[PDB]
Amino acid sequence: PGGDFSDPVTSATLGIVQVFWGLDKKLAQRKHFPSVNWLISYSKYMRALDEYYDKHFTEFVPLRTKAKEILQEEEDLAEIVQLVGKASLAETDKITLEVAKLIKDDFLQQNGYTPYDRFCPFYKTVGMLSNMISFYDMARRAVETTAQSDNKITWSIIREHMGEILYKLSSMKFKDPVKDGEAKIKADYAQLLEDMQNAFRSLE
Amino acid sequence: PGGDFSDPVTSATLGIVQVFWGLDKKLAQRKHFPSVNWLISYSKYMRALDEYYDKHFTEFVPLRTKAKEILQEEEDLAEIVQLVGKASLAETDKITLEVAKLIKDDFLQQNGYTPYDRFCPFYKTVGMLSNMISFYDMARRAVETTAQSDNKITWSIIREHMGEILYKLSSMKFKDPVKDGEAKIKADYAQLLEDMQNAFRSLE
Amino acid sequence: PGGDFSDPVTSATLGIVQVFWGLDKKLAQRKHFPSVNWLISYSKYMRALDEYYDKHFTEFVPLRTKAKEILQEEEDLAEIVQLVGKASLAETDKITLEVAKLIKDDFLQQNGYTPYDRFCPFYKTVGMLSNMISFYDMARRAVETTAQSDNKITWSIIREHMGEILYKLSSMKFKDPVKDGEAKIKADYAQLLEDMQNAFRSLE
Amino acid sequence: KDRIEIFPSRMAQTIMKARLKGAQTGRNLLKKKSDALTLRFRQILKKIIETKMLMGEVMREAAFSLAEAKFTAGDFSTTVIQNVNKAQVKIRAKKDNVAGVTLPVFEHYHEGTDSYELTGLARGGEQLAKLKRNYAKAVELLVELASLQTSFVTLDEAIKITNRRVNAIEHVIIPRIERTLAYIITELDEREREEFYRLKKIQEKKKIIKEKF
Amino acid sequence: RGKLIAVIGDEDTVTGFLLGGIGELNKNRHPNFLVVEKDTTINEIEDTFRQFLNRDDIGIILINQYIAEMVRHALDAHQRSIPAVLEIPSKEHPYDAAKDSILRRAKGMF
């Protein structure tokens, strides 16, 4: 009654249920379907499904761990950057913030009624997260390595160099797996990954 | 209870009532009587009074709306003139501040221990406000024209040329209608208006 | 319950008990045993002991009032020095802060395991406070004397010239009653007082 | 976010009131600091403008002294350009403590060396000596002005950051604490009224059983 | 005692100030001034200016108004209190108050 989580019904539910998907009215104000919170939600079946997921995919655990770390880092830095003014930031911190708002805009947001977005299978989610994690690793590595030698790669510089590829990352969602075949999507994402590597190597 | 506007009773009374005359202690400390806030006070009966005002005066409503706008704009500009130092601004803004001050010191105040300032006739108030706002209108138009045409007139020039007129505006409140006739007061005010018109014309 | 005054039993007890010796959770966390609050605790028996003091010691009351004043001043200036970066430390502020910190870290704490801290005689406390307050007062007198005439004295030269005196004052805490007798400890304190006087006269 | 995550209680109210009071005191201290720095900013800006309008006319005087010297003696630009070995004017570091911070300024000093005392010995050097005096005065005034301008930039930055902290505190911390305190008050009232209902019910039941007899 | 002012300007102004008692051959055998004649390139002017900025021991630099305006983007690109730069008047270019970087910091405060 009012969104406060201290009421008896919720308190009883917490001690019984094992999967908890807490929602947030602020995202709902922002029209961010689904308005999951992804800081208080938890699942007690993480290790239960490791054997199943490793029987099939096996490229998921680094993605999950890195994603949780990235979101935690951004959430920790949100208050300090708010207080200072979002100016005194190291290159690694800037990279983390940039990829964080990207992954929010690209993976968290979702609408279940746009035709291409009515359904999204697990292989496609894994592929998208893998592409984003590859972006993060490559960009962080590039800026980190070049931070010490010469011609330090700035966020503005990489953004200028491959702003279009960022739009491609934005428009990955427009697939509609009902119509277009799985192999076509996999090939397109592989080609995109190769293009991303080439764009990075252009300035490397 | 201590000025907290959060009582159930006070909130409900605010909901029911239509007029509100906010009262302060700070002004009584500042040596200004009567104590009105001019910003948290409000009236909702103006729509009904339009008929009576149109039937008798036909200027009170525009003049009051102009006065309210000027007072609110001066309250808005008090902060900018605080950050500039109250020693440099555009002439139009300066004259706006000056008329807001004028309205403060000779219109929005009344002394209860002065025998002749314990009762101001409504027509006398209307005449005073019309005189003041006509003076301001002519000053503003003169400055705005001369800003682009030739010999931009500054408020220093205006005040020095017209210091006797500001003296007469300040002394307008000492009329004492109890002993002094209504027609005599109207004739005096009209003569003052004609003198102001001729002075403005000689200025430009 | 919860380290607070919300408890009606606690309120009733405070309304009746003469001497309240409230404890402070923050210093208890700091492990500055004993955890006495020194800001909310009170003793309404000071005035009763005036006759006994004036009969037997005749010097404790001035020293005690001065000690309480210096502690209160440091407590009040704590937030002021906290919120200014500890850079605008006036000379009197530095004198007060250093003296009160020494009194709070050395003269207001004891460990019950050691044999030299399981009981402090009243004359032992009198001597400790007398010596420390004499040091404070003479330093303040020197600083204020030199400030008006010439070459205002800071605490750096005082540390340089009375470094030995400060270590002697801090080691006054470890003059064991078990080993040294009453005469031995009093003579020790008197000799340290003489040495402080010698050093201060040398610098003066 | 919306309110500090604390379970409401009787002690919580006094804790949050103390926090609000401390925030208010910090606001007051930063506000006074900003006011003092701004007043000094006004004074230094006005002084810079004055010193500059005087620097212009003294520089014009020195330029005309140069023009006079170029006639009486002719031209010596190469003679003085291509023999520079040591400087005759020196600058030392200095700082002035205003409003709890340090304003860097510079100490103008006369170095006791000399490199152009004998130039134009026979052709003529009276105009050269007048030019010498004029440029010495000009150098003094320019060093003064440069010190003023350096301190001006530093003071402007200090004003900027103190107002930065002021606005941060004023527009974040206070409403959060107020909202938390209001929530605490509402929750306490809720618990109190529940207790009241429960006592009222038990009293009514006791009356009901008593009325049977 | 350890800081030496520097001057950049036309032959007349550099001559005047080098009389005024500045300029010194350091251990690497360089002056503390630049001669800007009609036959000078803006690029050379910026190169010398950047060299002077990298030389910490200068402290103060004096440039005349029209040269400060000739190179206005690169002069404004450097913000720092310690290496002060001052615009000064000249013969055919009297100083202009409406053009001064330090006064741009006090924007609108007139």
PDB file of N, CA and C in Angstrom, chain E residues 15-52:
ATOM      1  N   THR E  15      62.906  46.893 -27.391  1.00  0.00           N
ATOM      2  CA  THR E  15      64.020  47.776 -27.074  1.00  0.00           C
ATOM      3  C   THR E  15      63.745  48.556 -25.800  1.00  0.00           C
ATOM      4  N   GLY E  16      62.536  49.102 -25.686  1.00  0.00           N
ATOM      5  CA  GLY E  16      62.192  49.866 -24.504  1.00  0.00           C
ATOM      6  C   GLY E  16      62.291  49.046 -23.233  1.00  0.00           C
ATOM      7  N   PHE E  17      61.752  47.829 -23.247  1.00  0.00           N
ATOM      8  CA  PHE E  17      61.740  47.053 -22.011  1.00  0.00           C
ATOM      9  C   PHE E  17      63.112  46.450 -21.715  1.00  0.00           C
ATOM     10  N   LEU E  18      63.886  46.100 -22.748  1.00  0.00           N
ATOM     11  CA  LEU E  18      65.239  45.611 -22.499  1.00  0.00           C
ATOM     12  C   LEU E  18      66.112  46.717 -21.941  1.00  0.00           C
ATOM     13  N   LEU E  19      65.844  47.971 -22.322  1.00  0.00           N
ATOM     14  CA  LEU E  19      66.377  49.047 -21.501  1.00  0.00           C
ATOM     15  C   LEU E  19      65.825  48.936 -20.094  1.00  0.00           C
ATOM     16  N   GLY E  20      64.498  48.850 -19.950  1.00  0.00           N
ATOM     17  CA  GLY E  20      63.822  48.832 -18.657  1.00  0.00           C
ATOM     18  C   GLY E  20      64.358  47.807 -17.675  1.00  0.00           C
ATOM     19  N   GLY E  21      65.135  46.842 -18.152  1.00  0.00           N
ATOM     20  CA  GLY E  21      65.964  46.030 -17.282  1.00  0.00           C
ATOM     21  C   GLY E  21      65.550  44.585 -17.161  1.00  0.00           C
ATOM     22  N   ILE E  22      65.256  43.958 -18.295  1.00  0.00           N
ATOM     23  CA  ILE E  22      64.871  42.557 -18.346  1.00  0.00           C
ATOM     24  C   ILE E  22      65.715  41.882 -19.420  1.00  0.00           C
ATOM     25  N   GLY E  23      65.561  40.568 -19.534  1.00  0.00           N
ATOM     26  CA  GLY E  23      66.362  39.821 -20.482  1.00  0.00           C
ATOM     27  C   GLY E  23      67.667  39.355 -19.878  1.00  0.00           C
ATOM     28  N   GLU E  24      67.958  38.064 -20.011  1.00  0.00           N
ATOM     29  CA  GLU E  24      69.140  37.481 -19.396  1.00  0.00           C
ATOM     30  C   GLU E  24      69.507  36.209 -20.140  1.00  0.00           C
ATOM     31  N   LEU E  25      70.790  36.064 -20.449  1.00  0.00           N
ATOM     32  CA  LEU E  25      71.264  34.838 -21.071  1.00  0.00           C
ATOM     33  C   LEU E  25      71.426  33.751 -20.017  1.00  0.00           C
ATOM     34  N   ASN E  26      70.631  32.698 -20.149  1.00  0.00           N
ATOM     35  CA  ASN E  26      70.576  31.635 -19.158  1.00  0.00           C
ATOM     36  C   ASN E  26      71.719  30.656 -19.429  1.00  0.00           C
ATOM     37  N   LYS E  27      71.677  29.488 -18.781  1.00  0.00           N
ATOM     38  CA  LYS E  27      72.750  28.512 -18.950  1.00  0.00           C
ATOM     39  C   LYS E  27      72.757  27.906 -20.350  1.00  0.00           C
ATOM     40  N   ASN E  28      71.593  27.773 -20.984  1.00  0.00           N
ATOM     41  CA  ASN E  28      71.507  27.289 -22.358  1.00  0.00           C
ATOM     42  C   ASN E  28      71.712  28.391 -23.390  1.00  0.00           C
ATOM     43  N   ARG E  29      72.007  29.616 -22.957  1.00  0.00           N
ATOM     44  CA  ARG E  29      72.329  30.726 -23.853  1.00  0.00           C
ATOM     45  C   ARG E  29      71.141  31.072 -24.752  1.00  0.00           C
ATOM     46  N   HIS E  30      70.054  31.490 -24.111  1.00  0.00           N
ATOM     47  CA  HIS E  30      68.896  32.042 -24.791  1.00  0.00           C
ATOM     48  C   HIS E  30      68.472  33.339 -24.121  1.00  0.00           C
ATOM     49  N   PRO E  31      67.892  34.271 -24.868  1.00  0.00           N
ATOM     50  CA  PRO E  31      67.314  35.466 -24.253  1.00  0.00           C
ATOM     51  C   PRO E  31      65.974  35.129 -23.606  1.00  0.00           C
ATOM     52  N   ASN E  32      65.304  36.167 -23.113  1.00  0.00           N
ATOM     53  CA  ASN E  32      63.943  36.064 -22.599  1.00  0.00           C
ATOM     54  C   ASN E  32      63.004  36.988 -23.367  1.00  0.00           C
ATOM     55  N   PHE E  33      63.214  37.110 -24.677  1.00  0.00           N
ATOM     56  CA  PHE E  33      62.370  37.980 -25.483  1.00  0.00           C
ATOM     57  C   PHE E  33      62.374  37.479 -26.918  1.00  0.00           C
ATOM     58  N   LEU E  34      61.386  37.937 -27.681  1.00  0.00           N
ATOM     59  CA  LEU E  34      61.287  37.648 -29.102  1.00  0.00           C
ATOM     60  C   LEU E  34      61.088  38.949 -29.860  1.00  0.00           C
ATOM     61  N   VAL E  35      61.777  39.075 -30.987  1.00  0.00           N
ATOM     62  CA  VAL E  35      61.595  40.196 -31.898  1.00  0.00           C
ATOM     63  C   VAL E  35      60.572  39.764 -32.941  1.00  0.00           C
ATOM     64  N   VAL E  36      59.483  40.520 -33.049  1.00  0.00           N
ATOM     65  CA  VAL E  36      58.447  40.263 -34.047  1.00  0.00           C
ATOM     66  C   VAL E  36      58.458  41.439 -35.019  1.00  0.00           C
ATOM     67  N   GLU E  37      59.040  41.213 -36.189  1.00  0.00           N
ATOM     68  CA  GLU E  37      59.069  42.203 -37.250  1.00  0.00           C
ATOM     69  C   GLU E  37      57.915  41.937 -38.211  1.00  0.00           C
ATOM     70  N   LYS E  38      57.883  42.684 -39.313  1.00  0.00           N
ATOM     71  CA  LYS E  38      56.907  42.395 -40.355  1.00  0.00           C
ATOM     72  C   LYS E  38      57.153  41.015 -40.952  1.00  0.00           C
ATOM     73  N   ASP E  39      58.412  40.571 -40.956  1.00  0.00           N
ATOM     74  CA  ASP E  39      58.793  39.268 -41.498  1.00  0.00           C
ATOM     75  C   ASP E  39      58.863  38.216 -40.386  1.00  0.00           C
ATOM     76  N   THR E  40      57.710  37.970 -39.767  1.00  0.00           N
ATOM     77  CA  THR E  40      57.568  36.940 -38.745  1.00  0.00           C
ATOM     78  C   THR E  40      56.304  36.146 -39.026  1.00  0.00           C
ATOM     79  N   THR E  41      56.336  34.855 -38.708  1.00  0.00           N
ATOM     80  CA  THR E  41      55.177  33.994 -38.888  1.00  0.00           C
ATOM     81  C   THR E  41      54.477  33.740 -37.557  1.00  0.00           C
ATOM     82  N   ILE E  42      53.144  33.772 -37.623  1.00  0.00           N
ATOM     83  CA  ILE E  42      52.312  33.506 -36.455  1.00  0.00           C
ATOM     84  C   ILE E  42      52.714  32.186 -35.811  1.00  0.00           C
ATOM     85  N   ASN E  43      53.071  31.197 -36.635  1.00  0.00           N
ATOM     86  CA  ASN E  43      53.499  29.902 -36.116  1.00  0.00           C
ATOM     87  C   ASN E  43      54.734  30.041 -35.237  1.00  0.00           C
ATOM     88  N   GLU E  44      55.726  30.811 -35.693  1.00  0.00           N
ATOM     89  CA  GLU E  44      56.908  31.048 -34.872  1.00  0.00           C
ATOM     90  C   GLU E  44      56.535  31.755 -33.579  1.00  0.00           C
ATOM     91  N   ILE E  45      55.591  32.696 -33.653  1.00  0.00           N
ATOM     92  CA  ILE E  45      55.175  33.394 -32.439  1.00  0.00           C
ATOM     93  C   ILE E  45      54.596  32.408 -31.429  1.00  0.00           C
ATOM     94  N   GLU E  46      53.700  31.516 -31.871  1.00  0.00           N
ATOM     95  CA  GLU E  46      53.143  30.551 -30.923  1.00  0.00           C
ATOM     96  C   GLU E  46      54.209  29.596 -30.410  1.00  0.00           C
ATOM     97  N   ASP E  47      55.153  29.199 -31.266  1.00  0.00           N
ATOM     98  CA  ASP E  47      56.198  28.289 -30.809  1.00  0.00           C
ATOM     99  C   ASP E  47      57.006  28.915 -29.680  1.00  0.00           C
ATOM    100  N   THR E  48      57.423  30.169 -29.855  1.00  0.00           N
ATOM    101  CA  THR E  48      58.169  30.842 -28.797  1.00  0.00           C
ATOM    102  C   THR E  48      57.310  31.032 -27.552  1.00  0.00           C
ATOM    103  N   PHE E  49      56.026  31.349 -27.733  1.00  0.00           N
ATOM    104  CA  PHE E  49      55.156  31.542 -26.578  1.00  0.00           C
ATOM    105  C   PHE E  49      55.014  30.255 -25.774  1.00  0.00           C
ATOM    106  N   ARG E  50      54.820  29.127 -26.459  1.00  0.00           N
ATOM    107  CA  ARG E  50      54.724  27.845 -25.768  1.00  0.00           C
ATOM    108  C   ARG E  50      56.033  27.502 -25.071  1.00  0.00           C
ATOM    109  N   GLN E  51      57.166  27.817 -25.705  1.00  0.00           N
ATOM    110  CA  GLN E  51      58.451  27.592 -25.049  1.00  0.00           C
ATOM    111  C   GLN E  51      58.548  28.397 -23.759  1.00  0.00           C
ATOM    112  N   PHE E  52      58.115  29.659 -23.796  1.00  0.00           N
ATOM    113  CA  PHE E  52      58.150  30.483 -22.590  1.00  0.00           C
ATOM    114  C   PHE E  52      57.220  29.931 -21.517  1.00  0.00           C
TER     115      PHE E  52
END
